[PDB]
């Protein structure tokens, strides 16, 4: 039934979900190596991701891979990185950036493909819509504290805010990220990229 990646994808372009952009020639985009290890899960593609066919390939991610302490090359090219974001398609312009995930995606296609990933030791959630996810979290309650407590939720799960330029105010106001929570998610993943 949906025991393989390829039978994934087709259910997911199939869907009726999704007939916009199946009739448009765009696949959902998602990075599933058999061999992952750490899977990374944010909010959705934008424009540029759609058409690239990669995540985390600009500044962001560049600063997410610095938190990590991993190289562009490793990130890429290790096969220990899984990216499985909330939506799996661009979800559209909203008036200050990408409008949000749609609902009920992530509860859709998720788990069978976790299913096919057997080595997943930690995963990293990004921003709100994944914590209140994978978290089973009312909508009420705070990325914020979230972060600061991240220890909960350890060894599954680590929770971060987003890598981007428009949260360099909120690392100022916040410097236990990157002096405490940053380390130690650097410490995990060595452990688990040395692991085996």
Known sequence: AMTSLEEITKAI??????????EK?????????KTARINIVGQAPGIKAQESRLYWNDKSGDRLREWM???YDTFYHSGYFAVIPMDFYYPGKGKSGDLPPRKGFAQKWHQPILDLLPDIQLTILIGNYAQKY??????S???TDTVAHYKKY?????????????NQI???????????????????????????
């Open 170 to 196: 909120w690392m100022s106001r916040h410097p236990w990220f990157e002096a405490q929570v940053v380390p130690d998610l650097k410490k995990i993943i060595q452990q688990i990229i040395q692991s085996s």
């Open 141 to 143: 309650v705070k990325l």
């Open 69 to 71: 302490g991993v190289d």
């Open 13 to 22: 372009m199939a869907d009726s979900q999704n007939k916009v952009f199946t």
């Open 154 to 166: 350890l060894p599954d799960y680590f929770p971060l805010v987003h890598p981007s330029p428009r």
């Open 25 to 33: 020639n765009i696949e959902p985009l998602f990075a599933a190596p």
């Open 134 to 139: 994978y978290l089973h979290q009312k909508s």
